[PDB]
């Protein structure tokens, strides 16, 4: 199978993910250069739908020039019936990654940690709140974190959960780039116990209770690291009012003292 | 490997499930009579959690003379360490079955819908309410549907979504009967359109608001069974006052006429 995107040809090595209408193509250039190729089939989507995805799309090629801890969109192709989109390979998503992994080093968890506040902060510095931040959206790009999607249009998963929802979604039932600290509490909760702060409940209500419950409270077990223990209480704050930010936690002694 | 309950032994086949804490085993008796095993870990148990498998296991015993659509208990062996149910063994869950199903009968649906409501209208009556009705939950046991758990206490997965969550239960953040109802009329709405209601969501935020909005509207396409139209939409109703009940469902044309 091969695949043409603005002139240039490209041959399909293999499929990484499915979403039920976005497709993602580990491909060669004629260079014999990796990339990979996002395909979205557009033949069922409504007006506002694709306005979502131009969205997306136009804050992808605005952002490129402002961190390069987001993902490189090299060139797409984009008619009534499918988007195409010629962006950098990476080695493995970062849930994938972390199943794969039982444990992990120190020092990679505060490199991953710093990587995705740049990625976050670029994006909420241009007025976009992800809002449904988990370690999918991150990929591992030579041992770098970049941010895969913002928010603004649909996900995949690789060839859905309410673990790292804040309190204030539940609530409203308000979202601020306080709610993306939350989520990324909760990444670095998992990188740290190796569980999210209520994965360990099953039914899903009573989940969702226990995020907005004031009395119902986390555990944050004694570790070695007491920098990253602050962190983990500031990020899970219940109050967004009360809950660190990411400008703050770029100052903070485990981000900047090694 | 092997296993004692109440002086019988058992020789595990294999693991069958993993959960947190349970575990499920396909054993052989002794006549090589099969079997499933639960196990549960108690070592690390609250009195709450205790008390909430005690009640379970009260209600499996209590509702045995009940219902033939309730998973068969045989014995059981509790101490502070742990349980073991001796319960009969299925050919394979509903949600592995649907899975692997890409189209159904319309025999096979209607079957197992009866069997469905059978078993949920005889926990109601002894005042339980489920509400983590979900796939995973029905046992097909000889072409017959068996509930599994009563959501009293925990669940597990083979060796966590809000698809199936009533719009009452988001809306307290006020669970009855209905809210069963709901979640029964997602797993019908499954087995004829192939996915659920709110399926296509990817956002976990969104979908919670779909869910609860009384604009956006399900879609209902138009299929022979009229009767299983008519059923859809009366257990997706976002009221539950309006809402279809389980005795109604069950001297419903789509049960009763063949
Ligand atoms: C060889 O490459 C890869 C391998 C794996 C991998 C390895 N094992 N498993 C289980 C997965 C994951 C990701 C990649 N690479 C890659 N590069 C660019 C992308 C751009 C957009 N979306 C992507 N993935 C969407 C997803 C998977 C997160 C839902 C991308 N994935
Ligand atoms: C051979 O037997 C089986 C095979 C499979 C199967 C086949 N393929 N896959 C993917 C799964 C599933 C279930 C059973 N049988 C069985 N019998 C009694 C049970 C009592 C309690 N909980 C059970 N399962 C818990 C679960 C899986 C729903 C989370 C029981 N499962």
Request: proline share 5%; hydrophobic share 35%; charged share 25%.
């Amino acid at each position: 199978q091969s695949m043409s995107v603005k002139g240039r040809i490209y041959s399909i090595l293999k499929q990484i993910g499915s979403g039920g209408s976005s497709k993602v193509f580990q491909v060669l250039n004629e260079k014999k250069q990796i990339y990979a190729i996002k395909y979205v089939n557009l033949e069922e989507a409504d007006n506002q739908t694709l306005d979502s995805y131009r969205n997306e799309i136009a804050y992808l090629n605005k952002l490129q020039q402002h961190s390069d801890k987001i993902i490189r969109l090299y060139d797409y192709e984009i008619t009534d019936q499918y988007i195409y989109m010629v962006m950098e390979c990476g080695n493995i998503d970062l849930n994938s990654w972390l199943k794969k992994k039982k444990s992990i080093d120190p020092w990679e968890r505060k490199s991953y940690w710093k990587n995705m506040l740049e990625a976050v902060h670029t994006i909420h510095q241009h007025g976009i709140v992800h809002s449904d931040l988990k370690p999918a959206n991150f990929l591992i790009v030579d041992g770098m974190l970049k941010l895969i999607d913002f928010g603004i249009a649909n996900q995949m998963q690789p060839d859905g959960t309410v673990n790292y929802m804040p309190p204030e979604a539940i609530k409203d039932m308000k979202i601020s780039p306080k709610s993306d600290v939350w989520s990324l509490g909760c990444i670095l909760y998992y990188m740290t116990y190796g569980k999210t702060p209520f994965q360990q409940i099953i039914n899903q209500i009573s989940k969702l209770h226990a995020i907005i419950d004031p009395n119902h409270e986390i555990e944050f077990p004694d570790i070695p690291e007491k920098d990253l223990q602050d962190v983990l209480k500031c990020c899970l704050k219940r109050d967004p009012k009360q809950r660190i930010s990411i400008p703050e936690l770029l100052a903070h002694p485990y981000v900047q003292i090694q």
